[model samples]
Target chain A: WYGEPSPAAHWAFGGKLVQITPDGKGVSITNPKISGLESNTTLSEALKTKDFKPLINQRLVKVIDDVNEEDWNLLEKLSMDGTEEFLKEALAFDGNIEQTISKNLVSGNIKSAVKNSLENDLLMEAMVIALDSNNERLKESVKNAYFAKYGSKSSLSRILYSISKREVDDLVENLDVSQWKFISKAIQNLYPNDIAQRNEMLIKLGDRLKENGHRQDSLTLYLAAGSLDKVASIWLSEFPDLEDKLKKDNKTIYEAHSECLTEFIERFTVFSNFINGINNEQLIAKFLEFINLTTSTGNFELATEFLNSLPSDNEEVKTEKARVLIASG
Target chain B: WYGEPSPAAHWAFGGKLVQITPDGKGVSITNPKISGLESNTTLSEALKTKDFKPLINQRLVKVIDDVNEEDWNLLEKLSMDGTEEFLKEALAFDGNIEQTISKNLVSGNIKSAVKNSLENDLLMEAMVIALDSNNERLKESVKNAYFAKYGSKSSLSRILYSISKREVDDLVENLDVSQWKFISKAIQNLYPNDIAQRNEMLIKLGDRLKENGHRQDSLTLYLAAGSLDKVASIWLSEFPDLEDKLKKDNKTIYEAHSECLTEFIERFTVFSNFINGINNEQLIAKFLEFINLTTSTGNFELATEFLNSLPSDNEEVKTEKARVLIASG
Candidate 1:
């Protein structure tokens, strides 16, 4: 009777009540099963069947904050048996669906039922409630327990897939490709450029993709997001045919290996291509190396003229000059 | 006569020849020393003091393309004495001053006279010739020999300093900070921002500066170019009062430890302030740790609710979720 006041008062007034414990430590209440409470029916069927006297003297039977051992057990039975109906009524009663569901699911202490909800395609309802509760670990537990309930291919995976694919708006922001390769595919298909940030993560993923034998994908990713030299090296090693392909399209060979002067030189001729390529930072580095090499070989005349030809304010030239001066003495 | 044709012809036609050898292998032209040609003089002295009788029959004199040992030595003597005027005459004789200077310097084979020219600040003329010759080794030797000519605190150091300081614009581009610590100081003072590229070089230089006891300069440079975290760490360690200083300036604590959420939380308390700070990626990382800690403490309730309160679309939140999902299994 003490479990919830309104219900306790209603039962006490509408049904016969008797104290059975000699010490008045326990009480018995005979309340017939109300139809609405017995099934997933509306409040219209509140007491339509299992008829019981509805007349109640509100002044005679005030709600009491007393819970007997029997009352607690019976309340537990009602919550467990009510199933969907119990949550529905609780939702209506509390008007805080997120809180009621969270409180019920947690207090119910039945992991299997949450799993049942997932299997029945009803996990999203649970997820919404779980997330809204502002209790991170409970959300985590529900997520984990749900996954545990249904393995990789269950409703959870479908949920993850939808979330990753942007089919659903709620949790996609918190989904990452690393969590699921499928999610990675979804991300690539959904928002590829977002992942193309030229950072360590991109290179790291490219490495992993290549190691896992996703060669072409990795190469494309590297070309898009990784270091230019690294991409050039891979192009030379794994995509040699791509050179002719690019050439046929009238693209410059320097365009492919532009990030690497040494490599750029190997693919280009000085008389025709090298002069133009000299505008690149890599070529500036090569120019410095050549000057230093020629000078060290006692060809100061050659080094002097070479320096004259290059601009002093060029960033690469300045950097190399600094490197050389420090290294020379 | 074979040394250079035009000059030889001018001497042959204008002077009385004395044959030193048969078969015209050697010929001596008796010419009184021109006043300007006797020492360093102007072009007006090119032939001013070289007096000779011009008397010749049709076959009396022939311009021979031959240099005997004596004639070659005489020509060398003529050039050194001619000074600037001699070069002017030579320029009139040989169209290329670069070639003429190079030929005379190499043929004379006098390193000390060149050193004399260096002392007199005339080596730029020599450098001009040396570089134009495409004889790199010769240029290098000349430079080294010139420096050797005056080891320390001479025109060379002055030249280097001026070149490094942009007093001489042509060489400053090739001037390296490593070449001279004085050069480095001049470079920083003259062009600090040049080294302020936001890259490893900046940090490397900062490390070098700090090691060399230029701590304040290094800190300023690191603040300008290093990582946010690294700069913050150094500030906390070196400028202990910086935290309060910034706070007193009405800056958020978040601004002080922008790179670290643990540090942020230690110094800040308001939930709204914390939430605002979580927008930073570092704070997201800290939030994950907090979630993990709360979960380990059996407070799943708290963890679930915390995540709900955070924006679902946050990159950090997404990354964290993926990590949790992948790692939990």
Candidate 2:
């Protein structure tokens, strides 16, 4: 309450503590020697405002070890060339763990870089470069080398190997959630001609992902694999939740159902973001069926709209659409 | 707008166009074929509301090409195994182009996957697989193979090669901002014993980046390099902006400068997330000098705070700190 200095953290004679003045416009200090920096005489702020305690830190400054905030402020002010000396003195500076490789690549010392990376197990880095360069002979050697060394090592490697060989049956058997990101991209990006195999694999992958409780991920696969039923069931499960949400007096059960139906149908418009030639009479019929409440409510106009989703070629839809339109008109 | 349908986009007899009803409660339709989905008679919403025009889409649904919303719904609802036929029919479904390799990997068909990837020039894919396996022989071979093919190709390749070799000299001259993401990570992750070279390279990189209008990036590099002067100068240049901002009655120049200095100092705490052992006597002295107005304005308490940042060992700082404290008390 008195707002006076107390014995604080690691303060010594001649040590500096940055603080606000008692009047609140500028600087202040702790008692000399009692809380001050001793003969060593360092300047630092307190963690506690009233107590003049030391500021504690995890001790990293700008991705460099051993440099503190005050050190950064001053260091950043200095010239670049001469600062190296001071930096080493200021920081227990650790150098980069991966070096010489990128520089070699940049300088056209490719053979040396590649050999060095091999020595250091930097194979992936080399691979990305090779891929970018589209080199055939080198690509071949790398693959041979990789398979010879890692063929039986891990399940994930095995999955990637499967991708390389265009084998569909085994890819999904050991599928995990973490591998989906890469596998999905690969499925879309690779093997453009194997529609049959790709479709089957995607279907399999989608089913596996869903079984593992990864419904969000599964949904995309199902859509990609052209398994509409999977998409429908998931959304249908959501229907009850919509009904429940509206039960909080958001809308009547009839209107709420209609709203839900509208949302369900509207999403198809977004689905076109993935696929374009969407045609599914059976599913549309189900969507239309959800509109029974809208129809029974004597909104024949709405009924006609819902009926329109049904194929005009269908006998039942033709009769119903006409009947609804006539009555509504 | 009477809200009647006109000749809309590609509507045919019996083609259904979903729209809001007159009452705004449910769906409505356009003229069958004249504005409807004609004899084909498909149900979909319109892009424009009042006119009931057809909904247009780029035709991607989720990440799958050629599937639309309605298609996705039915496909997702269907069983995975049986949906392939309908999917091919529903979508001009192009299968993934990059197949075989990933699948082969999964099935433990390592030779097949590897050989196939090589033939297809999927060098990077092979490299990632090899790298992940931590197979030293394979890694080395991949690198060797890659350099043989791509060593003389692109400037980027040369850069990667440099990263592999631990050479510091040529890496920064052609450095681009886009490369920073990988290069920064590489630097931090590699070369743990070459502090002298590391510090020198970082300062040079920071300077180059700053000269190229990449101060945001350079700031991190400068701090990482322990070049405090660079940090100070950049912040000092920002002082005018802070003062200018405060000129709009946010504060007087005195308060504004103080505020700017506070912000400047606080950022060091964040910098401490990178470096820990920050100590800069000259910089602290300069920071202390910035509080002249607060002291001149008779806030001796505040003056003591500003004074506290100065080294207690300095004859000038020692006497000034004592005087300010006595007067403030």
Candidate 3:
């Protein structure tokens, strides 16, 4: 009620990953899988004969939320049939990886589930099924399965599998190079004792993020890691893409180059908005390199615009501004 | 090759439950769930490069056949990580019947999968999940869960759960009144030792079949059970629906009664095609009752048809024929 839209109220939930739009009919939950829900997702049945629980207990409704996971295991535990019940089905099943994985879901035999995928060369699926389980023994088996198969190339697996098990780099020299969307989430859940390791994981992962051509997502990692040099380097790299474009387009003339100057200024403006706390000669040196590239490429006008836009409030940013303008004038 | 359809040939398998139609383009598996398979269900890769096996091994194709249940566990065994891995995930999971079921497929924790549904009052899903597992312990858990919760109304679950463990009526006094399609299949697979019990289970299920209004299905169960009296009882029951309709529609007039007579005859014809060896005073007595009803309803012409159509090779059919025709003429 408090978040009610004025003309059209907007609301988001599920860690803001989902949006709910309430209108003349009812509330429509919209997400990546929004279409299949139809009318089932929005229930006003709470007013009547003890629903949600009872209605779903009767299985007249399928609650497609977090509660399903809880209701499921509680029922399983209360019944106490898990161990042997699972194995019998596993034997009856003749399956491929997904179907092999399917048996484990029925049995809670992640070893069977993960082993089938792992041996079949689908580490991605095996590890995901194992990790989402947050199962200590399952995680160990996955870790053991990797070593028991006695490993070699440790990029994706090491980046992921190494996280819950050990310390970070320099240990992260193996690096969190991929799956930032999920991997970043794991580090946050990775706990506080690893404050140093968490930063190590994030900042190293951010370095790879820049490698893959993402400024926005990459910046958040370094921003959280508070790695000034990493953030500054990512911003500093934006200079190369712009400067190369001038030569590629033959923008040597005053009017053509003037337009490129606006392109440079907009790029600077985007960088300006993303960082508030990032600083220092550690990264200030990188900004000077950017200014020199512009001046050496002979765009004193573009260099001056950068000088003015640079944050003068910081000594490092101020010193770079002075260093560039002194030579340009 | 033996079953190749002649001229626009037809072939059926899986106890004739499925039909495979092949023309110029490979082979298409057609079943009740036929539409979803698309091109995936029909694989010609069986021809080259050690395909079908290798192709599915790579998972470039899914071999949706009997082989899946086999390959699945074989991989599970080859990995040997199943037991503990399953439990860890079971602990972490928050799930419902299907999602609870989803975990078992992953971890082989079907105890969690089935008990959730069973305790949740969805005996159908619980029993089905257990029965399909063909897992002895899983089946036992399902059986025990039903009773340790020590049951009362045994309709579907007892009809199912009671099959493997024991004998039939007097035992089947409980009866198999539902799931004729699946339950009937179970009785056949219920195996060679329980020969008398199989017929008992089948005939009992067929009796309930008549009560529900499925003559076509009921006949098969009784036919397989070789219960002539039960089959005749079913035929005798059809007499009521036609007579009731005549009175309800107010078609008691001569011309209208004659039309209703034809309705009775057509119903007999359908019954005639479905059974052959069925007869006797046990059943002959029942047909004579039908002839008497038609004569009483004032349609000797209809009664004459029954007297003539009654199988006269048997003394029972002969006596009923003579008793009706002699008096009618």
Candidate 4:
């Protein structure tokens, strides 16, 4: 088997986000029935029965780098004509994209799969473009895919990226400020409050400000956002308290986030360390450390809150605050 | 005095959900400011300097019961003309809803304030109906209102009444099942994987099944949805070693439910105490107790896995499974 994990196996397990190729005319499925290599008899029987075509039709398989060459050639053939019936037989071998990718170790078709995965990955950028072009099915397909898999990693990452890549400054400028509350709340919910998002928003706002010749004003916004990064980090140092409250209070994460905001703003706004003891370097370092701890502990809420709390507007105040903080330090 | 919490105060101070009343005119906000409050220095400064209009304009005040009749008439006249300007001078109050609401309470316009509150309340209800009909907003206002106020007896009771009276079954039916996964994970991230949502869904599912036709079927669904309630219980009783794992592992719930399915089909296909445990009453009691425990403990994920695992569209199997489930008790 090839050493590295093939992108196809690693990225697109169900063929939902990748396309596979076939080189042979017919795909030979090694029925787990033929060999007890992949699974126990119970699983083999449950998964490999002949009458599963209807169940397996919606399934997709991509040949990757671990499977034998014969299987790779077989996948190539099926890519051309492996209809639902063929997929049913293929699936009987526990031949998900992962297994197939692994089984097709000697083949060069992995390149095609990787390319196809990127092309179709989230397809969110494509969706935004399609939305601009008024392609309804394309829009709906992206929507349906998102609907099926929003919270899952790759799908959410694509959505987050699409949203991040949007001209949010333009969107913000044109949008009614009063209406910002609604849109902001919706975005927070949709994104589940990531700190990186806030940090990026700060950068975008700065750029927008810079473009608009409000560079000085944008600096304040940058500082405020930057402070949020620091505050979120400090908050995480005390996150056990936050996490304990959340776990005991039986509140939603949003509720918990609001609680965090309340506590942080209340507690840290008064702390000399929060208001006057930090600088940009310290803020960024603290943020990195916060994220590191969150990843280690899987306390993504605290992790994301740090990322999400970066200032987007009113940067002048934040920048000034940071300056005062540095002076104090 | 008109006695109610302000929407902003609820959200800001307590992080609670409050209804927003979108009047046919400008939106009539429920004015979430906590009353009987003195102004913070900033608000007092804003009020003293005639910078109160913006904040006042945001509030939808009604002089129903927060003041006497004379002041009520006066405030109504002011509301008709320029409320913020009038209240700024007349109440001598800062630009805080809390202060303003309190001032009205002491000034003999409490009746009118209560009336205003009622007007907003009715308006909130109508807006809810409108939103539900339109389906544009991501949230169902009525449902959200109910959920937000779930801790309150009057609110929860009123919500139940409204649900029953209006045949709000459709809301339950059209629920976004996947939303649960998102909310659960997010909440879990905050609350440490509380599985109460699964139990809640199962409870709702049991109720829905009962609504559809068969109580027996409902009971079966509840027990199954409760995740082999009997097996989990028996296993806990028989083996304490597995108890900790069962409590924490997502798969244990499934295994427990699977065991019930297997046993029902294989051992308890006919109605008997031995099948269910001994008698119908005990079986029903056992299942009810199990579900109640689930709800109280918030094992939402485990409950849902059981529901998701249910075999669909196979009538014979379903009934057969039900029969065994009934007999097992």
Candidate 5:
């Protein structure tokens, strides 16, 4: 069987490496012409740009030529954004490949499509390739993929929630609101930002979040709402407060844009700067303050109690927290 | 004879009872229903604006009315933009106050002048209060003025650098890159984009940082170039073989500004969306990549090894350094 042709990846100094492996299984590439730069900086920056294009092009060309048109179309998506979208498409391809081969399903286009998309980084593409023959490998690869691409606390939460209520309940019961404010504020602020699509999503999500109460499905909606709310929180932070009908909590939301924006930016600075500096005392105090001060509708006594228990003698802890408050507040 | 102020502030709210008490030395007054936001946000923001004049009318009228014009004039110089200038004045004031107090300085007008400036949160006046006070109960009351008006860290750095290495190191270590970037970019990029000021600062810093073995210090200076270097990182991330000659790393201090500006904005977005999750793997990875890439002159390999040794099986963790290479290359 003739394998797919290799693509050419050109690097700096006019050096080009052709993709020699089919479906981008394995390739060794070298950066060419190290001496063209007038200074180390020129070289460093020049190394940052179009140097990787020839490599990407070589693979794309091979896939386009060898893979059937439909399979090539599926593979085409890989050339797009390398972020979450690319990841999603990759997972879908993996899922499709599993379904196709498991029951001996015969769709030429789909089979080849899955194979082609599985090119590039092994970690990224391993799940789909496992469908070629190895059931043990398939499970392993899928688990790895799920962990990498969807390795969130929510993912952990869902699995635990599905398996055992005791664990889930313990998490919920022990969850201190004050300690969770950083997460909560993050979620609260991430609410709907975009008008059409975001609102549409939120409308559905808000309905589920309001009506469903703490179910798994409900939590997902809450997650979506929280994420979207963050977008608006950011955009609104810099906007001028106006005499809109949405005053008070509604109007406060307008005032919120700048105030929260400042808090958000400041928190980022603090987090980036002081992430390592946070001690248990500071963390506890921060958590307590976060919870006690965040929501009008929450049990804040626990947070206050936690704050009260911190060693009163520790001035450094108090000073650090005070700084955080001044910075984020 | 003023007694120490309470450690816990009693925030006056509407519908609360006001209290007033006279100790041996000073009167303590509490007012209920101090209006405006519940949070001290407006108060904090107002301080940044140097609008603390309101303190004179509200709490410090007796003190402000007593100070003579010359002392007030000296205090007014403390209001200039640079903290370095402020600290120099503070040092001068510290010495002058010490000399005057050694002679048992006690003119009725001079006492009033000290009180007036102290009440206005003037640094020198606060220093005088702290140095001269023998009252056991007046410590916090006197200290409050100094706490409110401490000079900026940069000023602290300049002054303390001469006296203590730890103090200078602390300031340098805690130097808020984000705030510095904000200040530098705002000063450099606003209206005319002060290229000369930026170049002067960059060259001076580069020259000062030309120590044989201070890799970390050099890296910080290079990053502070804060202009197009930042923009190139963004553009180069998108088109990693950018062809602009002016954009080369060594010749382009603008790239530093550009990269930092982009990161500053980018970080705020990530932080704002933090509810969706922080992706710690990415953060840790970025930190490692930053250390490694920037410290080619340093022990970058060792740094990378240290970063890689962290017990993270997460994909983001595993790929973060590599991804940085992709983005920064």
Candidate 6:
């Protein structure tokens, strides 16, 4: 009846001190706790036997060491799949250890699994699995986990960015308006120099917004995307005094309209500086058309002053000054 | 005899119309309103006389174009000085015009006048005059006027920036801690690379804060200014476990202290990223000295891992690895 040896007490066997007899064979081992062992073991007899390796593994090493590779793989997969079984396992494991250790095991392993998913071009699969989960906390955690892992170079971010103007119309054709926020963030993350692509994307987005009844957002989106004609029309209708000035200026209505075309090139500088996309010529054409409908408009000194204030050597200024002289004269 | 010119009606003369009888010799004028003047007047008779220019000089053009050069200079000076007399005049003028017009006249001219003061090395005088003014609104208005006129690169701003470090110790030596908000804004506006000067300025600011019994502000200022040694000391004293860790371990005590000194270098990365000025070598030496006092402390795997995570080619990493290996081993 050999028992596991103790490291703390060199001569003591694995049995606990149960009783001490006056006759001095004090320690008694009842039914050795080691696996496959018989009952009625005396501590002195257990100490005499040196064969304790089996008992050491059975009684002393409580941590599991014999897990099969297939079982470990399934355990890892369970963390990523986020099923009820995984939640039960995680909570049971957490009940024994501190919460942080449990979090690392479940949350940390899930993050690693997400990275693995991205590496394999399974981003959509990962997003779908996470989004479809009924667990709200799991959704937030997965987003945070994804952001924490991928940062600016997120594959999902890249996918959305690539499709914004390229496959945009079809991709967003039936997307719920509430889900537009994700697309909006992707648009924000688009590279700064992709102005033309951004313009096209905004135009498509504006159409979608209008379709969804987001009137103000659609208006603002069109304004940002360089739809100056509509904006100009709105401006004209709102300000009757400007309309009157367009009609009442010294030149005839057509001539006044023709004259303002050149001045509008300078005028669009303010708009271009504020909003990014409209071509100088396109904005000027819109403005001149607005002015052409009014006969009283003549001087545009304010617009000329604003244009002059811009960098003198800028090509925009050069183009502006050349065309503007025609309108002022 | 002719009467003086009427300001409202140039040709009607200064007298009121007496009658509008339909007879040939119809209208008659009463005695002239002019002090030097005349008797019953006819409009035709008044027109024949070329002496109205003198009366025009007297009664018309009452907008005060005949200001003496000396008086004009004094008026200009009054704007910058913001003396009681200027305040009274500003209120009266503001009462006549709208507040905005008055602000332009007094505050605008004062800003220009303050610039003139800066050109003449009278910045202190200008600041003193503005600060000493009992009118709180006037003081704020004067500041707005100065900023509007001069902008960020104004001479007054330049003076404050230039002397921040050079005269920092004394500039704030006698200033009320509560009144230091202005200096704080100026400090914030300083260029980033000028950290040494900022360090000196903050040290003085910290001393002033401490003297004024503002302990928390001093602590925060020290944190911002990169006084990591004192900050580290405060943290260690507050956290007993770290202090206890420094106490036990083999030559543990010595090794513990030594390990901390080398590790303090890594610790400072978080601080340096947030704050501006700290002498790196000095901080390392302090940390090493602390580490030198501790021993028995093993298991520095975490610190070594963090060091490895840094950019391989970073000079900081190179410096850290060489010293860190000694304690880590």
**Candidate 2 lDDT tens digits, A1-329:** 77665433343223345566655665556543322112111113331132111222222222222223444444344323243454444332221324556555544445565556566666665465554443356555555566667754565455555655555456466645546655565565555777767777787788788778877667767767765566766666666775566556456765666555655665543343344222465466655564454454434544565676555777777777766667556
List, residue by residue over A1-329, the lDDT tens digit for candidate 6: 67544332222222332444444544553322433222212211222352322332322222112222222233234334433454234223212122222122223244444344445443332342333233444444444444445423532333322332224444345444544443443454453468778777767776788668765445556655667555444333333443345467655665444434433332233233333322345444454443322212222343454354444555655666555556556
Docking class of 5: incorrect
TM-score of chain A of each: 0.30, 0.44, 0.34, 0.19, 0.15, 0.29
Over the stretch B1-329, how does candidate 4's per-residue lDDT look in tens digits? 88444433233212123443433222232323333221233323333453433323322241112222232343234435553464234323232323232233334333343333233443221221222122323223433343344312322232222232333233334433322222222221232344565445544545555566534334433442344443333323333343333345444664544333322221111111111212233333333333322322333332222322334344543553453344233
lDDT of 6: 0.41
- Residue A241 deviation, candidate 4, in Å? 78
lDDT of 2 at B303: 56
- TM-scores for every candidate against the unseen true structure: 0.20, 0.30, 0.24, 0.16, 0.15, 0.21
* CAPRI tier of model 4: incorrect
Candidate 6: segments with Cα more than 4 A from true spot: A1-329, B1-170, B189-196, B211-213, B226-273, B277-286, B289-297, B300-329
With candidate 2 superimposed using the best TM-score fit, by how many Å does residue B321's alpha carbon deviate from the native? 99
TM accuracy, model 6: 0.21
Once model 4 is optimally superposed onto the true structure by TM-score, how far is the C-alpha of residue B232 displaced, in angstroms? 13
In model 2, the Cα lDDT at residue B263 comes to 46
Q: What is the lDDT of residue A31 in candidate 6?
A: 25
Task: For candidate 1, give fnat to 2 decimals.
Answer: 0.00
lDDT of 1 by residue, B13-45 (tens): 212233354444565546444322221122112
lDDT of 1 at A78: 33
lDDT value, residue A303 of candidate 5: 28
lDDT of each: 0.38, 0.52, 0.47, 0.34, 0.34, 0.41
Candidate 5, residues A1-329, lDDT tens digits: the string is 77556564544211334454556767766433324221223223223442323333433453312212322233234334433364333323224333333212122232343233333333222232222322343333344444345333432222222122212223222332222222222222233254344434433433433343422233233233333232223223322332122244343553544333333332322222111112343344434334334221122222233334356567654664454344334
Per-residue error for A110 in candidate 2, Å, reads: 31
Candidate 3 chain B lowest-lDDT run of ten: B35-44
Docking class of 3: incorrect
Candidate with the larger DockQ of 2 and 6 = 2
DockQ scores for all predicted structures: 0.01, 0.04, 0.01, 0.01, 0.01, 0.01
The per-prediction tally of clashing pairs is: 22, 149, 51, 67, 45, 35
Write down the worst ten-residue block by lDDT for model 1 chain B.
B51-60
**What does DockQ come to for candidate 1?**
0.01
